């Protein structure tokens, strides 16, 4: 719990610094250091759920605090400050928890999906990592939590499927293939 609090503390410290002085700030000691606590925090979270062996207990205790701490934080971050590894960290947990998380896709996709999509829908170049990861996530959800794609309204579903079209139009071989 505390680890999530500090993660969120740093995540909000970084985003502000950027919002106040542009991307450039990322290129200096303190920020790069704060990025590290976040990334290792994510490594730890995903690195454990992977070798965990009690899906439900994991989905009922260690997942809900992720929502406000990491997801809605990733949402409120300025575009330049959002952590790509957030998406890939989440992708891994879906692969593991599978059906046990199918009911949280609504809450999750809200925060990350649309807001991330708007970062990668202008061209095919900017925010590379965000492209790659985003689709590893979408792949995972579709792969182990398909029922979710039915729960949501036709308007949202469409937005999802057209996002896939967008994937396989990419010139980055990996992104287009995942699509």
């Amino acid at each position: 719990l505390d680890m999530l609090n500090v993660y969120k503390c740093l995540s909000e410290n970084i985003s502000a610094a950027i919002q106040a002085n542009g991307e450039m700030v990322t290129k200096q000691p303190l920020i790069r250091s704060m990025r590290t606590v976040k990334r290792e925090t994510l490594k730890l979270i995903s690195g454990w759920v992977s070798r965990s062996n009690d899906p439900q207990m994991v989905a009922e205790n260690f997942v809900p605090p992720l929502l406000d701490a990491v997801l809605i934080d990733y949402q409120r971050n300025v575009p330049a400050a959002r952590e790509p590894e957030v998406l890939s960290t989440m992708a891994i947990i879906v692969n593991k928890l599978g059906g046990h998380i199918t009911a949280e896709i609504p809450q999750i996709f809200d925060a990350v999906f649309e807001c991330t999509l708007n970062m990668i829908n202008k061209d095919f170049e900017e925010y590379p990592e965000h492209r790659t990861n985003f689709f590893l996530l979408l792949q995972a959800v579709n792969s182990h939590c398909f029922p979710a794609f039915l729960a949501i309204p036709p308007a949202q579903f469409k937005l999802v499927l057209d996002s896939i079209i967008w994937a396989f139009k990419h010139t980055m071989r990996n992104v287009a293939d995942t699509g």
Binding site: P55, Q56, G98, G99
Partner: protein, 179 residues
């Protein structure tokens, strides 16, 4: 009255394997009569008919796997290509006693190659349930918590235990397939 008499006839013929082993046609006629009695709804008849059948199989095991005069195919084949039509009206335990009985026949085929094919088909019916329950568990492990599927896993196993008691070592081909 007819059931009390038929049972005694079936008891007597069950005590003289020496006579059955010298008269295939009679043995054949007896076995088929037992297969018919296995759809009899009169009290006890089905227990009688199974007891006799396992008895006879044990003591005449060789005659079922080797081609007899007047035939062109080992009796086991007819039996295996019909397991379901014979045992469809039997209770759970009786079905186990039936599987144990055929198991003894299988144990007679000392020829490696053929015994292996016999074994694969012998355990084909129970395997379907197994294979089925297994794939679904590889999507949601909360299924191995389902009262009905657990009831089946029990009966499948129970069936697997009897077959093994009679087939012997060669049964390894099965155990290995699900171990």
């Amino acid at each position: 009255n007819k059931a009390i008499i038929a049972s005694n006839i079936m008891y007597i013929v069950g005590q003289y394997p020496r006579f059955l082993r010298a008269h295939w046609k009679f043995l054949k006629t007896v076995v088929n009569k037992l297969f018919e009695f296995m759809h009899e709804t009169h009290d006890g008849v089905q227990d009688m008919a199974c007891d006799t059948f396992i008895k006879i199989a044990q003591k005449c095991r060789r005659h079922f796997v080797q081609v007899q005069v007047g035939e062109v195919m080992p009796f086991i084949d007819e039996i295996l290509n019909n397991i379901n039509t014979i045992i469809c009206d039997l209770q759970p335990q009786q079905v186990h006693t039936f599987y144990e009985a055929v198991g003894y026949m299988i144990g007679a085929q000392t020829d490696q190659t053929v015994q292996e094919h016999l074994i694969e088909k012998y355990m084909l019916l129970p395997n379907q349930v197994w294979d089925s329950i297994i794939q679904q568990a590889t999507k949601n492990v909360d299924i191995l918590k389902d009262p009905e599927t657990v009831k089946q896993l029990g009966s499948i196993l129970k069936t697997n235990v009897r077959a093994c008691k009679a087939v012997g070592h060669p049964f390894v081909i099965q155990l290995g397939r699900i171990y």
